[PDB]
Subunit: 257 residues, 5 copies
């Protein structure tokens, strides 16, 4: 094990995040926007896959979607950009280890969440302009998925959000624990396969699901109300998974007591 080294790295990354934000809100928001859009790119890919295999009646739909989502977090980690969901574990661990404050943590979470959203809104806009969701099985996949995610009960979304961010954050944790970029990508691939195929909920990914569905004139039954309901429920779950499980857990393992 190298639990203490790992906690040191998490704490140093938390310190580095808040110093970045304090040094430049533009730099922090651009990074956050990049991460939001990168995650959204994975969504565009796997929903195209979703539409294609759904229209085909394939039993393998959710499995192929899961296998194909690795790009989302892979791009985030390989570009060193700012992802809200990953920040749940990093800021909480660093905060518990007294490297950052609670205010620092809430500031980082707020900014990366908004930045992530800006990225998703841009992607959504651009994607709608390609005409790829003007009509057909791919537009319908966005339309139906958006609707079902927005009509789920609060408790279900919350618990799905917890399990999702346990997986997002453990993949981030693995990247702090190896020097091999290939190993990092493989672990990301495995974790995101688990997330998508199992049906867990990811606030940042949902941002693109809703920006596309909402910006698309291919009607679809969503509404901003439903989008907000889902994002709030899922964000709360994500925070619990990342901070209360992963952040607290890694702190307990690594705390120089």
């Amino acid at each position: 094990r190298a639990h203490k080294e790992t906690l040191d790295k998490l704490t140093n990354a938390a310190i580095n995040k808040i110093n970045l934000l304090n040094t430049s809100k533009v730099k922090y928001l651009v990074s956050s926007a990049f991460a939001g859009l990168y995650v959204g790119i994975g969504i565009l890919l796997i929903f195209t896959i979703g539409g294609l295999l759904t229209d085909a009646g394939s039993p393998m739909t959710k499995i192929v979607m899961g296998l194909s989502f690795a790009i989302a977090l892979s791009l985030v980690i390989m570009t060193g950009t700012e992802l809200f969901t990953g920040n749940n574990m990093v800021m909480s661990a660093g905060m518990l280890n007294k490297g950052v404050s609670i205010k620092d943590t809430s500031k980082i979470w707020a900014y990366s969440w908004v930045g992530n959203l800006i990225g998703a809104l841009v992607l959504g806009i651009i994607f709608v302009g390609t005409g790829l969701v003007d009509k057909g099985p791919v537009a319908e996949f966005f339309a139906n998925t958006a609707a079902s995610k927005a009509s789920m009960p609060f408790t279900a979304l919350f618990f799905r959000g917890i399990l999702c961010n346990i997986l997002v954050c453990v993949s981030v944790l693995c990247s702090f624990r190896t020097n091999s970029d290939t190993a990092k990508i493989i672990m990301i691939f495995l974790c995101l396969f688990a997330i998508i195929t199992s049906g867990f909920e990811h606030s940042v990914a949902n941002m693109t699901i809703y920006s596309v569905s909402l910006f698309s004139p291919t009607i679809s039954t969503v509404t901003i109300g439903g989008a907000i309901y889902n994002l709030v429920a899922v964000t709360l779950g994500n925070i619990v998974g990342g901070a209360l499980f992963m952040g607290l857990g890694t702190y307990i393992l690594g705390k120089e007591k």
Copy 2:
């Protein structure tokens, strides 16, 4: 050849394990709980696959499930967390090599088994909360699988547990014999593929099978009694495979006489 050095690393790992437990029961149990939960995440993924493909009558079902289970031990190894089944070989070799004692071994086995179960209990509760096993093929897949595992003859479960833990512990052994994290993950992928598709029995994975099946009000094919029956038989078989084959074996290979 390099068996001596491998035995040396195994011995040191066994020494570090008992020192951790002597230092902090909380740290040790948290690490164990993480590992039990990580293994369970693999179960949630492949049982989702099992439900999807069984429902479709696919002949590829058990093959796809085996290929998709790699995350379970990959997460454990890459996070440095405490897994009971792997401890069967490590403590065993370490004890034989006079680095730790018999009571040290029994203590580590008991705590890691219980801590792993804690992780499975937590994951099961949260998974039930997702609503993902309310009804439909995934719930059916948990219910039917838990039922069949609980009604297998003792001897069958025992021998399945032996072969399972030979594979788990050899994947752990490979991790002690390479410096490449990518190669570690590949070997784990191969061994877990063999375990799942061949039909071998893993006590720690079964903890999540039974936590989900028993916590879900939607599932009513098994009882705590059936869970205990399967867990006891499979755990005994696991111990024989990890300690009697892999532990004794690596000691013999490595013991500088």
Copy 3:
């Protein structure tokens, strides 16, 4: 982090490109020609797959095509040759960081683009010469695809071009951010999967699509006006994606803000 170091690498890459171009038109155009042909090789592969699976009715067609396209940018990055689409991000970042001039940039872009085109033309001539697109599902896939791309609205092609080059350029960016050649190839595989299966537009790849179709004797029904319209719309799209998004974006991330010799972020 580590964005500053990444910015320094992009800027050095930019300076090296204009330098080599200044030194030898021949060296630069051959490098660009290789890159154009390498990308086209990917097209020849996935369009053969397109033809095969389309004629078979498969629903996995576009997924298998996406999974099989990695060779295109993998070859470019592993041979270190000049690809127009990638040059958008590198030249703009370097220029913004005041390592290369606006003049240097539109030059590299011009030479790389044309050089990429030469490669596609030569590949197209040779491929048709194999007789593999004399008749049948593959020849048609080339034909029908060429027609559909040349008959889409500007807006659509533009935005498809933006998204395409975001992905092309981010894979180039990953290659600057790791020392693992395997991780580089894996990131390329993922990005190109996303590009092809999602349906984004790549100018350099389109160069080979139209060269084959305009060289193939199985008639056409696309025409040269269509091709150039496409390459124009997609190229502008590509430029915005790579220069406006990736170039400016990486500049902002990496530019050490003391300096400040000129502009202040907030």
Copy 4:
């Protein structure tokens, strides 16, 4: 090209093998037993696959089997254990190069062959004990394969053994020519894919095929005379493939003359 360096490595390895055997028969036999069982694990997996896909009438059966066999030699190489077929090239090259005697070679061949057999016997007994070949397509797949392998003309088996051990030994040769463990596993994956899907014959894998077939009450398609016939023919072919092609070939490339 590094042909001399490669022969120098093969020669050191031959020396180290005979020294080990001379030092401890128990260590040498235990190591050989492990390698036999590890290869056998590959057989249990791919024959499970065989039964599943053959029962389903799948055309991809032999392809998936080949893709799934990599674990057999991957485990042997990553654990550093003694495999008879690999020793055909190593001992012969080291013998030609005067690092070891002809008698050392005979000794190593006989001991590893028998030790491999012990591992296969042990694996077979335990596998039968699982109830996994009690009845159904997997048992039938063992029964049918064991029978066809036993009824082939000597000539056919012999030449199949030559090509098999060209592939086993070249994968071993690859492992001497790289420092990348991931590259070693990939080359093993490719070679074993070629062996299984093409239909070549591996003596050590066949030990497990026949141990299961002869230990399972539900398998009556073959006799001990039949196993012995196949094993002799295939062993002879393996020896020619490994020693006369790979051993002599690598000696010729590397010998400073």
Copy 5:
């Protein structure tokens, strides 16, 4: 790093001719291994071809391409002498004045013949397994051999060109990376392209014809057919490897 790459190709060309000059046996043995290693890839993918063609699968050519990587991977990882790869290496080394034209034709002649010996040996042994006595694999060899030998010259020539661009560029990648895993991946991608696209490889065809001509399965092949295919494809391979990759890498790297 074009200059360093050209230096590497030049040093590889020099070491090849030096080797041949020192020992024809060592050089021919190495060439025979490379021919057999490439042939092993053919045995595997033609087994796949027979299996899937018999089943009417639209994935046949795709699965074959994905499964051919072993052919050049064995060559590169064993350090053996492959004719097609020597088209780029010797030409680059020659233009860079490390070796002569005479050296090049010599290395080409010896590796081609050595590759062929490896293919003949493999074909004989494979026929001896009984695996092509009858059935869809035997049929796949016979039909493929016949189709390749009945193609027009021009078609074979151009397919040979694209094939060796891919073979040689995979070799080029191996000179431009220190990662053995990256080398294998690049080889996997290039061979996937070669096989699935339908390009022509002289050395691989050596095994196709040695198997088909040694096997009991009746084909319309004939030795005259094989030789015709091999000549046309070899010239195409030479053009692709020497004129494109050889000349190209020299131009990229030459410090002038």
